[PDB]
Amino acid sequence: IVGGRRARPHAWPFMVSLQLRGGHFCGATLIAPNFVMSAAHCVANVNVRAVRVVLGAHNLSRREPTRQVFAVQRIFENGYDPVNLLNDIVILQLNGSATINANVQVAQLPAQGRRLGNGVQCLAMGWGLLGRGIASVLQELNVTVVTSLCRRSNVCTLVRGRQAGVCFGDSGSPLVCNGLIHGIASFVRGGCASGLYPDAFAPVAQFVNWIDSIIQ
């Protein structure tokens, strides 16, 4: 997150760090005790048997007894199309179920097909690059939905009046709009925080019936 701020500790208890050897590489969202959802590009080319799913985290640099760590049992995809940057969504089934508490909560999803109008206010968040290197403390950022310089196959967002946006390592992190997870961070254009191209998220609302079929 470039140009954002520290989140309050455990403000977003559905927020997940995907890690290897350990080190954060992608965000994810807890959508049921035994499922997280993330971007398909986060795990294409990764050995998922090595991925650790870290719930309840805030400051990645510290020991945190609030954390719960799972492994990935299986992956559900939905036509991931990297060439056209489409269907950037995966559901990872965990090897066990999270204990739901103050620091670990299931996210709330929108209605199937629900669109967001130009001007909708959301928060992006994640432990991605700050502009520097990876964040230790979870970061958040106020962003605004734009439909211009964005396909109907994405939710796009832009910060106006300064350069700020998601960046590497924020991939797969939720975009929360009106208390609901409406995006998963997917791609940027013009480099991070260009101040020109909107950031692009997988449109979770298009995938809700598919998500519901998997998690129950």
Ligand X SMILES: *[C@@H]1O[C@H](CO[C@@H]2O[C@@H](C)[C@@H](O)[C@@H](O)[C@@H]2O)[C@@H](O[C@@H]2O[C@H](CO)[C@@H](O)[C@H](O)[C@H]2NC(C)=O)[C@H](O)[C@H]1NC(C)=O
Ligand Y SMILES: *[C@@H]1O[C@H](CO[C@@H]2O[C@@H](C)[C@@H](O)[C@@H](O)[C@@H]2O)[C@@H](O)[C@H](O)[C@H]1NC(C)=O
Q: Is 41 a catalytic residue?
A: yes
Which candidate in 38, 88, 170, 199 is catalytic? Answer: 88
- Quote the CA–CA distance of 66 and 138 in Å, as a whole number: 14
Binding piece for ligand X, criterion CB under 6 A, among 19-27, 28-36, 103-111, 171-179: 171-179
Q: Helix, strand or coil for residue 214? A: helix
The residues, any chain, with a CB within 8 Å of residue 3's CB and separated by 6 or more, are: 131, 141, 159, 162, 163, 164, 165, 193
Binding piece for ligand X, criterion CB under 6 A, among 53-61, 81-89, 120-128, 200-208: 120-128
CB 5, min distance to ligand VBM, A = 17
70 binds ligand Y (CB under 6 A): yes
Would you say 98 or 167 has its CB closer to ligand VBM? 167
Q: Find the binder of ligand VBM among 7, 145, 150, 185 (CB under 6 A).
A: 185
The single residue listed with the structure tokens 């991931």 is 80
The residues, any chain, with a CB within 8 Å of residue 186's CB and separated by 6 or more, are: 39, 41, 85, 88, 154, 171, 200, 201, 202
Q: Helix, strand or coil for residue 123? A: strand
Contact partner, 122, from ligand Y, ligand X, ligand VBM, none, Cβ < 5-8 Å per class: ligand X
Residue numbers of the site for ligand Y (CB under 6 A)? 50, 52, 69-71, 95-96
Instruction: Tell me which residues are annotated as active site.
Output: 41, 88, 171
